[PDB]
Task: inverse folding
């Protein structure tokens, strides 16, 4: 139950979205990133803790505003997972600007 | 105070652990009655008060929070709970202490009690020493010369309480003033769809992968960790002027507004800010500009009065971190009146909320400046 | 910087294609086989023929077996074995690790290379994977003897569990030093890696060469990678050893000697059943403690071990958890026996985190059999360049400042200083309380912060009146 | 439904909550309830973008205030605050 | 790395404290509970997440005031571990009111 | 589909067929198959359907 399992799910789902929607505008591509992102995060307690004990993702932040100012701890953890996945989907967007859209020409 | 002497803390203090607490049934709804109080903000929602081994918080004990924190002070004012963080500080002799006095003295040691550094319990620290006492004037005129200063500190603590109360009631009357006035406008005021007030922009976000795009720069950055304010003029994050080579941003003018559309609404009420320097924002919030048939404060306060309405009709849009949609926030219609009813009513409304709010011409800034001089007058009085 | 980014990246590229802890053994084994293949060849050429042959003349063969004691072959090295690309089968290298670890003459430091194994699911997949490993190690390029320094990077794969970051190790090395140009250095209980020993005298090889870096370590697989860790850095054969086993239960050497310098990094929560489970309440070394340490607080066992193997000239630079107030009566008298004499010299706090996920800092206890005498509770949180440690890879030149102000008994503000010799007996033997110098010192003027609010309220009254008028629209 | 739906736990009423009983009961005959869901139009969702759900989601926490009850009390507290400012200006000399 | 490993450490340490201090007043017994409690909690990231993915302890609360109103997530998790351990040491106090102190009579 | 079950026996009235990660709505397309006119189906799903 690594971080990379969740990232593989997000990578596959983003490939599904770009492959089946043919999105070639980067802002709509990042809207599809927002589509895939929460649709790839886990939901169980032990799964989220086993992802948070894994590599890649860190407890530290990129934006503290994504934290809801509330006492809902796994909401904050899932927001942190969301944040690390949005960064890794910036990297995946840099991959898929040149991965799939180039072959589809017929 | 003629003879001012130092006394130890544990001489006149019974400091104890609480009684048997049973505070968790799986509901603590508003319909319960006891004041439940812990550290941080001293109000957790109510609980059933009767028959739980309750200490019931009689006339003048006080408390201290916390293990590993050791800073917080509250008076059990009339009758309160004991809710499993309230280590009890009281007295065994009540003819000398009158321990609202020791609350009024004990907040004058910031030299060590404001040091959250270790995972350390500090029972001996605030247990042993010291405290300023007018001993040996006991019990004839010891508290009698302290009656002037308990008048001073009761009225000043009451000033802080009533200032918070009047700021609450002021924002209350002002929030209803935003909605009785300025709404149902007759007749008939033109319904303009949002975005037709002006061509507004999407966003734009780099990452920290290049250090040269992050270190220096004079263009500010608007992220939702600096949002929630009114009339934002600068921020904590500045972005590099070169880094708009790889930012996916646009230069917005010097009278824009910034509105958050993610991570705040679907649970809370979205804020908005007039933004005065040209500053860029991230993917999940919107920079809105008006155009030529407008007044930027009127469209600002029009969205600010109708913030709870733009989060309702498209509330869910999938159960995700995505929220009220970009198009479904784009497609809202607002009343835009004749040219005699933009600048007048928003002159009223800008006028009144730069009265009621932070920072300049601010009532809570008056409140924290009264807190500053409260600390200073307690610093000035309690010396000898 | 010089080539470290490229070597960094190509070393991280090897790490496919399944979990890295199990592949770590194989990657380091293949790298070490490459190093012996270079070293033994570069020895015996010291000159004409790269490609050797079975011309061994084994009366000559005992001379490097005494000189080096890794005496493999002339046709079974990595330059020679990795010419057999995808050659059935695997076990040739399992034979090619059989004999070079035999070499029983004399004083082995072998019994070593037994971490390369077989899994794997099928034997053809095992052959393909080990050929991929030797391929990737072949892909690493030297292009003169710091090729093993990338090893120091690669053991830092997880730390970016317990493998002691490098500049803190340089600090501990500068704390065991100095003013002591004396045989021998050095000793370490529970070395773990060979790192904090290695960054002592690798910088100080030109200074002095005395004797071995005597260590004892518990884990079996850590033992092998430590014994090659000090083997890669051109340390010679005879003295430079680690003994496997628990340091507490089976210490050796007892006899040799009260040392001149010990360093350590005992891992947290290294419990052992007591108290004692044997009759070592009346042992040879823990008798001056009075009471002996329980299970979960085994860290202060090490310091009771520390003053044993140390001469009057020696000093000890150990590390501990910060959370000592007096730790109950089980360690209050232990702290007492430490402050009974001039055993404890100084203590040093650190900056959180500057580790891999603790997120706390730790304390450094510096001990000596040496008399001045008062204690310098020489704490620090900053600076202590807390921001990162990525800058100044070579030297921070910042612990330089710390050691410099440690060196001659200063009394500093906005940084720690000395205290009284009986301040801590006035304390409840605490670590630390003094000095902790009182930062963020601020207060205000009397009435500058009230007349402005008064003027804003005078604005607020006419704004209230405009509010009362403007309510009628 | 979100409540009730005894959200507090489910440890009470191990045998039957008798609460889904109420839910099934109001499901049973085509009601139209407030402070709980109801029926909608057969073509409301073709007017929607085929969503699940938007309608009805009935509009809880409905509150507003009276015109001027929440301002004269703050005005009186500011009239206290002026003489407290004056006592502050006097009492600064000790 | 269960929750019960940490509870066994706390149980053993509390036995050490009561056995070597001879505490027979329940308020001082609970002060020794506060002594053993933070002295038994783990410190590493992956250890705390593996305890939080285990049984017994739950993400839900007994007192939200123990949460520091701050953005330090593993401080909040360690406070939750502290809280569940204080409850389980109420139970351990009920055990050790009659476990060890009765035998020591000589 | 990975097989030729785009032209299967039961998913033909759907028109398109469900991808990998959104397999939940495969079940409901299976659900109306094995059910008479008298029958009714009580299934559960994730909430996050806007139009997917």
Result:
């Amino acid at each position: 139950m690594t971080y990379n399992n969740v990232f593989d799910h997000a990578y596959e789902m983003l490939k599904e979205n770009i492959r089946y929607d043919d999105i070639r505008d980067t802002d709509d591509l990042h809207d599809a990133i927002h589509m895939a992102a929460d649709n790839a995060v886990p939901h169980y307690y032990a799964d989220i803790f086993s992802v948070m004990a894994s590599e890649g993702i860190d407890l530290e932040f990129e934006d503290s505003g994504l934290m809801p100012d509330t006492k809902d701890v796994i909401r904050i953890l899932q927001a942190r997972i969301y944040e690390q996945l949005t960064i890794d989907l910036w990297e995946d967007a840099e991959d898929l600007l040149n991965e799939y859209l180039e072959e589809v020409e017929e | 105070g003629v003879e001012v002497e130092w006394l130890p803390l544990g001489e006149i203090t019974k400091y104890e652990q609480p009684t048997k607490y049973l505070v968790k049934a799986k509901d603590y709804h508003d319909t319960y009655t006891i004041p439940v109080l812990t550290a941080g903000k001293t109000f957790i929602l109510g609980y059933t008060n009767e028959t739980h081994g309750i200490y019931q918080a009689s006339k003048a004990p006080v408390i201290i929070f916390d293990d590993f924190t050791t800073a917080n002070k509250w008076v059990d004012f009339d009758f309160k709970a004991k809710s499993s963080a309230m280590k009890m500080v009281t007295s065994c002799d009540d003819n000398k202490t009158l321990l609202k006095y020791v609350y009024y003295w004990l907040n004058t040691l910031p030299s060590e009690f404001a040091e959250g550094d270790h995972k350390r319990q500090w029972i001996s620290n605030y247990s042993q020493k010291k405290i300023p006492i007018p001993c040996p004037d006991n019990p004839e005129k010891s508290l009698a010369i302290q009656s002037e200063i308990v008048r001073i500190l009761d009225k000043f603590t009451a000033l802080t309480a009533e200032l918070t109360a009047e700021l609450n009631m002021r924002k209350k009357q002002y929030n209803y003033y935003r909605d009785q006035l300025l709404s149902f406008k007759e007749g008939e005021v033109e319904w303009k769809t949002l975005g037709e007030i002006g061509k507004w922009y999407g966003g734009g976000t780099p990452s920290k992968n290049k250090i040269e795009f992050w270190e220096n720069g004079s263009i500010p950055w608007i992220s939702p960790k600096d949002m929630g304010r009114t009339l934002v003029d600068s921020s904590e994050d500045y972005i590099t002027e070169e880094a708009v080579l790889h930012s996916s941003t646009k230069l917005i003018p010097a009278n824009s507004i910034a509105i958050v559309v993610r991570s705040s609404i679907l649970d809370k009420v979205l804020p908005s800010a007039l933004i005065k320097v040209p500053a860029t924002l991230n993917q999940d919030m919107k920079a809105v500009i008006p155009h030529e048939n407008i007044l930027v404060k009127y469209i600002y306060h029009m969205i600010g009065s109708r913030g709870s309405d733009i989060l309702r009709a498209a509330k869910k849009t999938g159960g995700s971190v995505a929220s009220i949609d970009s198009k479904k926030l784009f497609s809202f219609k607002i009343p835009v009146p004749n040219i005699n009813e933009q600048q007048r009513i928003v002159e009223i409304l800008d006028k009144f909320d730069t009265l009621t709010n932070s920072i300049t011409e601010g009532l809570p800034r008056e409140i924290e400046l009264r807190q500053k001089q409260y600390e200073y007058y307690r610093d000035l009085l309690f010396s000898f | 910087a010089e080539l470290h980014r490229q070597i960094w990246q190509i070393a991280n590229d090897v790490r496919g294609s399944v979990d890295g802890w199990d592949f770590k053994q194989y990657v380091l084994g293949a790298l070490f086989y490459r190093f012996i293949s270079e070293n033994f060849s570069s020895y015996i050429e010291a000159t004409d023929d790269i490609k050797d042959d079975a011309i061994k003349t084994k009366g000559y063969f005992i001379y490097p077996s005494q000189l080096f004691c890794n005496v493999a072959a002339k046709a079974n090295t990595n330059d020679r074995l990795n010419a057999d690309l995808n050659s059935i089968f695997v076990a040739i290298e399992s034979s090619a690790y059989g004999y070079p670890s035999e070499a029983d003459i004399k004083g082995l430091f072998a019994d070593f290379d037994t971490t390369s194994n077989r899994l794997g699911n099928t034997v053809k997949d095992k052959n393909a994977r080990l050929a991929a490993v030797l391929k990737g190690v072949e892909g690493l390029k030297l292009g003169i003897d710091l090729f093993g320094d990338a090893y120091e990077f690669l053991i830092s794969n997880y730390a970016a569990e317990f493998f002691t970051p490098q500049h803190v190790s340089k600090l501990i090395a500068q704390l065991a030093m100095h003013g002591q140009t004396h045989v021998n250095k050095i000793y370490d209980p529970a070395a773990g890696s060979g790192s904090l020993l290695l960054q002592a005298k690798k910088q100080f090889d030109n200074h002095i060469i005395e004797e071995g870096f005597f260590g004892q370590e518990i884990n079996h697989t850590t033992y092998n990678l430590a014994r090659m860790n000090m083997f890669l850095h051109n340390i010679n054969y005879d003295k430079f050893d680690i003994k496997l086993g628990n340091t507490l239960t089976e210490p050796h050497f007892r006899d040799e000697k009260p040392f001149d310098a010990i360093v350590s990094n005992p891992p947290y929560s290294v419990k052992w059943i007591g108290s004692d489970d044997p009759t070592l309440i009346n042992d040879e070394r823990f008798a001056p403690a009075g009471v002996l340490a329980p299970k979960s607080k085994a860290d202060f066992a090490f310091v009771l071990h520390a003053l044993n193997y140390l001469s009057a000239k020696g000093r000890a630079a150990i590390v501990c958890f910060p959370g000592i107030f007096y730790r109950g009566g089980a360690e209050q008298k232990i702290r007492q026996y430490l402050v009974d004499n001039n055993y404890v010299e100084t203590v040093i706090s650190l900056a959180p985190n500057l580790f891999f996920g603790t997120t706390i800092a730790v304390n450094i206890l510096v001990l000596s059999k040496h008399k001045t005498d008062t204690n310098v509770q020489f704490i620090d949180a900053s600076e202590l360049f807390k921001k990162e440690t990525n800058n100044n890879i070579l030297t921070d030149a910042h612990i330089e400042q710390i050691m410099q102000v440690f060196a001659s008994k200063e009394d500093v503000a906005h940084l720690a200083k000395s205290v009284a010799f009986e301040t801590v007996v006035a304390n409840d033997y605490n670590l630390s309380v003094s000095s902790y110098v009182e930062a963020k010192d601020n207060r205000e003027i009397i009435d500058i912060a009230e007349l402005n609010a008064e003027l804003k309220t005078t604005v607020s009254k006419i704004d209230q009146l405009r509010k009362d008028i403007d309510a009628i629209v």
